[PDB]
């Protein structure tokens, strides 16, 4: 699997009605874990996938970020802005996560909003993003 396969796999989410596939998300995460040397390009792509995917697929884009983000987080526990590090990838995600969350919520139906809220809670408990960032979104968008 090379970077073009990663692009193609992410792009294939357009053909899922729900925008969600556990096995495909795992495939993207395994790729992200195996190519941390190019995390900057991977993280840019999944950020931009969340920005550009259809409204009903926003939730799935946050699941992609959940899976890669927490997979990267679990590695950091075993330089904040050195390209090629899990830490930098997570900082990059965190700098855009408020934008991505508030747009996802605005475009989500009620059931997806509740699933986004629980994802917010998971991110709070797991330490993936700053609690301040997350609580801020919780107050403004819900």
């Amino acid at each position: 699997m090379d970077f073009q396969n990663f692009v193609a796999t992410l792009e294939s989410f357009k053909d899922l009605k729900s925008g969600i596939s556990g096995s495909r998300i795992k495939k993207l995460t395994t790729y992200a874990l195996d190519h941390i040397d190019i995390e900057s390009k991977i993280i840019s792509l999944i950020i931009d996938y969340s920005r550009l995917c259809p409204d009903s697929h926003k939730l799935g884009s946050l699941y992609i970020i959940d899976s890669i983000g927490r997979a990267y987080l679990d590695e950091t526990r075993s330089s904040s802005n050195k390209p090629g590090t899990c830490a930098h990838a997570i900082n990059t995600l965190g700098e855009v996560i408020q934008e991505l969350l508030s747009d996802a919520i605005a475009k989500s139906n009620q059931d997806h909003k509740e699933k986004i809220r629980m994802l917010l809670d998971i991110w709070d408990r797991s330490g993936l993003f700053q609690k301040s960032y997350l609580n801020a979104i919780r107050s403004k968008c819900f």
């Binding site: 969600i20 596939s21 556990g22 096995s23 998300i25 799935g60 699941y63 959940d66 899976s67 927490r70 629980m118 994802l119 809670d121 998971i122 408990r125 797991s126």
Partner: peptide
């Protein structure tokens, strides 16, 4: 083929 969320951060 849904996305399995982590129970240790849910319950």
């Amino acid at each position: 083929d849904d996305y399995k969320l982590p129970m240790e951060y849910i319950t």
